[PDB]
Amino acid sequence: QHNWQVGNEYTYLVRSRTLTSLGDLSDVHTGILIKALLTVQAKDSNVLAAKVWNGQYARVQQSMPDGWETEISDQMLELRDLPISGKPFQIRMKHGLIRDLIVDRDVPTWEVNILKSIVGQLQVDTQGEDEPYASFKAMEDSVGGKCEVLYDIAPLSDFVIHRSPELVPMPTLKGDGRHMEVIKIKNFDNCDQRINYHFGGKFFSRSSTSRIVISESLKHFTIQSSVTTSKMMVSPRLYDRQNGLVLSRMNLTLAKMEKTSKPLPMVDNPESTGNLVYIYNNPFSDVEERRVSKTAMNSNQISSSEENDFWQPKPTLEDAPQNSLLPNFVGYKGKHIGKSGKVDVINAAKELIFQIANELEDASNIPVHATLEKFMILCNLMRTMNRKQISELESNMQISPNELKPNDKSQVIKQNTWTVFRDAITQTGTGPAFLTIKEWIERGTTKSMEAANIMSKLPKTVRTPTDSYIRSFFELLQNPKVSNEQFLNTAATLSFCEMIHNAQVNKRSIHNNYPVHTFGTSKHDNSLYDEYIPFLERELRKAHQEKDSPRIQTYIMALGMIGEPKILSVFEPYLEGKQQMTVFQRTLMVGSLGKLTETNPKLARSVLYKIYLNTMESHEVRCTAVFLLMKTNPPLSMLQRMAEFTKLDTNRQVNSAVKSTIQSLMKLKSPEWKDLAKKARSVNHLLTHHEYDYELSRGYIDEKILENQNIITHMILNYVGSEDSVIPRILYLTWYSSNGDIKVPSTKVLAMISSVKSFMELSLRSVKDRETIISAAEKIAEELKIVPEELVPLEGNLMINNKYALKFFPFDKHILDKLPTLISNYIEAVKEGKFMNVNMLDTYESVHSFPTETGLPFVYTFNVIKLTKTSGTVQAQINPDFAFIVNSNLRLTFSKNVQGRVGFVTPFEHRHFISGIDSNLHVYAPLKISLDVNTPKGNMQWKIWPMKGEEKSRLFHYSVVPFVSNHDILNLRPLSMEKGTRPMIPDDNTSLALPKNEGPFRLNVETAKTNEEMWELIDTEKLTDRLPYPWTMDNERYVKVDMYMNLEGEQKDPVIFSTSFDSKVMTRPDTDSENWTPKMMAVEPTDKQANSKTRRQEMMREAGRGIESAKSYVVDVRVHVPGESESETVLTLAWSESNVESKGRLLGFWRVEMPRSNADYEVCIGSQIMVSPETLLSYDEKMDQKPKMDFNVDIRYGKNCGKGERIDMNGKLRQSPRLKELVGATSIIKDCVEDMKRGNKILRTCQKAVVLSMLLDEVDISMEVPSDALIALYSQGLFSLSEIDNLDVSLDVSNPKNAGKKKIDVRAKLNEYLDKADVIVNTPIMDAHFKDINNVFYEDETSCMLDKTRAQTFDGKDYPLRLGPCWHAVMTTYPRINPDNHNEKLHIPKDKSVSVLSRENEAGQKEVKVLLGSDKIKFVPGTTSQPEVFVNGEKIVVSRNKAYQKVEENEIIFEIYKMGDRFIGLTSDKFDVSLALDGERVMLKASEDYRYSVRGLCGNFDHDSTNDFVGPKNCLFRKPEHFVASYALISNQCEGDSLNVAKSLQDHDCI
């Protein structure tokens, strides 16, 4: 392995280059070139003498059409002098490859790195780990690190040498050997020592190649050339096509080969620099110091605490952190930026803060001043300060917000100064910053909201979480000024837990999100467990003792968020049952186990499964367990057992949850859920056929893959159904999107509530209306001795988590109690006037760095800055009649700036070369608002003004600009104003002024002549069709837009927006039933003004005539826009409905006026829908009486509504005889055929069967279109519909279906069984033929049947039945417990007092008594073809053409009417109940409001068919006879039988 023969003198010419460019977008290239000479002398066997002298360099920024390898002549260059400390250093050889270098006192570490690169360019391996061929792999080292390389050796032909003689300058050493070539390829995925700074495969495509020429092998090596080439491909904005390039090269070539003349001087100050990898330094020491590690391992022969590699020391809480790669830390010759003295750190920060504060008042010019970039520069600058400097700056600012006036208008700049300084301190993320925050809070400069907002942003800003940092944070957490308050305390504890988790709990978080390589939580530091877990344990126990809900929620969430298995031992005395706990707290504890599944999936899966198995637990807990269980990748056996259990499980909610979650894992196709898709598909054949509604628990996973950009976007949404109301209780929402190995952080939401009904009742209590009137309902409840259920406390959560902040808001009863007081206080606060100034500034950061192959740092950044600003005076005046008058003078602004940059930094010149793209968004709202709301009259009048002094201000600005830059690091200014920055305006650029006429708005869009996408989307108002089509809009190319306001000559004419509302009940002669003509006509009102009572009355009258007991509604809207061309607008709607007969009508009226252009347009609509068969319950299998459904739609429009294009659209439906055959040959038909033979009347099964019996198959839609343009539009729509995947392709036939007649008919057959439909389309222009619950009458799952010998409950229970002579209570409402006092009871609400009393006649008939608040009704059966109807002890007649109404204050109390063969009805609108009887059977219909608030024979109405046998004493029953006996009044007309049974039941023991 002999090489570098002793006594000889060599000489190698040195060339190298490093360039940064923007890839395919342009050809400009920014970078430097280097020239030098290297002389090596063979001093002895193992020590060589070297020297690098004659250093020159030049900087280049020019177009390179040929490529980055183009030779540039020295005449075209601008050579400089390289600050190289040319001294006779030395190099030593160790049995082959080079081992270590020697440097003198003139040791700037960057110079040593460059020398290391030059040395390592000579690295060769003649042997492995004649024979011209050879190949193997070696674990070699270089400047970048010790990554492995692949070798390849082969001789080089003479033709190549003859063609290109440069590879072999002087060939006279062929001798007995020849010339070879070596190719080395290095991969970076397997290394030993690495240098990097990562914060925030990973879109980092690296490469390395070499080429060395040789002489006679293994005995006379004689290196003669060496070329290394490296690339780095990176995406700028994390969603791009890799246009970011950083390229490098190093060149060596032999020049001289001759005898030594004079030995080089010996180095007098040995400074061993170790191996060839990059080495850090100290950025603050006045005397140069380096951290070089010399392992000196014997080797030979064939994280853990070890020396490993040299790392920078961990900084303290007072000293600044030490980094050796960022521009600010090693810009000035490897030292900190302020060491130069040309910049003073404190003064620069002061000027930056003053500029930012001053420019933040004139918000319309934020984009042109680059304020947000200035904020980022200030944050970077303050990342280098120490504690004394920030303290001195705070003293020098002469600012203290405590002395400031919060609502003053004079000290706007001072308040802005405080705000910007506070935001910068929050975003700095260093030890001194946290010390400053501790000093602020401890002495009391930020009391509650500011402090909590500050600590909500800490967990996602801190750079290096050290041990002493966390210890100080804990010491602050143990301060009385933080614990006693609530919102600050919860924010601080959550931030503590999150930072602990990130810093130590997850090793992946340590390795990825933090720069471990540049800085080396020790394993021996077991302080976490002992110091922290007992703290949270003890304080959670104390909070549980005190019975304080927000504290319990906060501390459970924190202990869950720490994410370690010890939380299981923490919780096991809680979940098991040793400590009492509410359902809300239990579900929060179960949901808190989310972080444990992502770290130790198996143990969390076991715990969640064990929770799931139990059935006696609450359904919300089980549901949440299911959702957490199927995010763990279970095996096939688990899911098989899941599906098997689905069928046999009684709980509807859990079944719905598991079925939905299993079924939702199917449409996915992506390499992260792929392994579970097959298992999901292998389960359907075990699932239950029953399909559940939407009010129950469900799951949904969404996928959106874009193979063009390799973008994966997800969404998870879960909810647990509520047992009291429609609105679900719990909600989850996650938007994690990953494209590669690095992804944007996840966004999560979690909302929870104990009970929706209780929450609404407490929130709406601010009405000052406590019920006092007592009706018969409370007497009924008291005599039955009804005890209400034990009330549950109200609790709630709301958590938001995203890139910026982590927030948490635990609810309580006390907070909702305090809400009205704060509302009132704010009400008199805004009585006269109140100024405000609110600013939010949050940012996101990510920096990645690693040395290049030329010996220079490479830094990549990605910043986004978000601003939200409000300012103005708001005044309100509230009156007891709700005369809510508000005047506001606000200004609104929103801006965003995202910028990604790639490049490198050269320490010896303090310069920075960058290529990247940045974008700006900006919106401004200088508006005045006047709001007058008068709620008794339904008026909602707005007035909007253009704010004075903002006649011509920017309203919109979007600009995307790519650039290349070459800027000094000492200067602290935005790069847009630097001289070296060059934008890349495309060659073919044209401007554009969108408004062709001088309208109120101006738009100025400029871009390249190409980009036809935006060039058509933006300005082309002609092709305004299929224009939006949300796409990416090629955001990687130059664009800039701006929209001003052209309003000049300040105007006092408001833009108004009015609204109204009304209702009425139609009087006697209008509903004469002779006014219903089969076809309607649109009505033209006599009055066409805005918000007119006459039009409302006319429409309401014409909408309800001919319908018995019909209610008409109306909604009137007005919009007014003044200016050079006024635009009035009138819109009215009307509709009718009645509970007696299915006969509804709709009407509309639209009209806009243009007083300047004299343009008037109108449209009138009149429609009706009727279903021919009257509502009926029983099967009535005799005869058919086939169902019918006809409707009419009529429109008319033009300058005058009456005279103009009128469309007469008529429709009709039908049921085919094939469905007669199917119904006559179906299961349910025979089922209740046998039942009616037995005598069953209103059972559930054939209620569903008659529901099917009232089904419609054929559809006959016809429309007469007098406009050919409408026909053409319909033809275009038909072609578009035929373009769909499922729709068959049908074209225009030679013979049109119809000629001279305008009509399109569509019909779907019945034999398809609604699996798919066939739709025929017959237009005069095109003919198309396609290839292959519902309407219900007075029946739903809600109702409760009460038949002669059967009983169907609210929730679906059946049991034997037999009544008696004395009254029984069917449906009742009972009073509850006062939330304020656990002794007093509240009263029945005025609009929810109902009692229903039944009876069995001695002759088999039935009697009905209903207590409707303060009224009573009795239904004597009789034998007069209808049960006798007495109202309040007075007789009323019910006939075919009359009906009973009780009307008060234009509201309906109850309706009595005759229907069917022997049926009469009672539907209470004010009470939301319905009843029907025939003297032999009664069925009861309720509303959703009565959930968990009724008790009687029907049941408790809880969507549960298991616990509907509960008595007044809240005791479950076990025999229908026992239940019927129990729920029986014993007042009068009763003796024995039921009385004896009730006496025995009282004597006996229930359950």
Ligand SMILES: *[C@@H]1O[C@H](CO)[C@@H](O[C@@H]2O[C@H](CO)[C@@H](O[C@@H]3O[C@H](CO[C@H]4O[C@H](CO)[C@@H](O)[C@H](O)[C@@H]4O)[C@@H](O)[C@H](O[C@H]4O[C@H](CO)[C@@H](O)[C@H](O)[C@@H]4O)[C@@H]3O)[C@H](O)[C@H]2NC(C)=O)[C@H](O)[C@H]1NC(C)=O
């Ligand atoms: C690592 O570093 C070394 C050191 O520079 C590089 O080696 C150089 O390689 C270039 C390759 O282009 C050499 O340039 C060549 O020089 C030849 C000799 O130059 C004499 O003759 C020309 C007239 O032809 C005179 O103008 C000049 O002053 C000299 O007197 C030229 O003949 C070559 O011409 C090429 O282009 C013409 C175009 O028509 C062709 O016809 C030719 O056939 C030929 O291809 C060429 O210009 C340069 O001399 C080398 N320097 C040396 C040997 O010291 C390595 O390239 C570099 N490694 C890299 C870049 O990977």
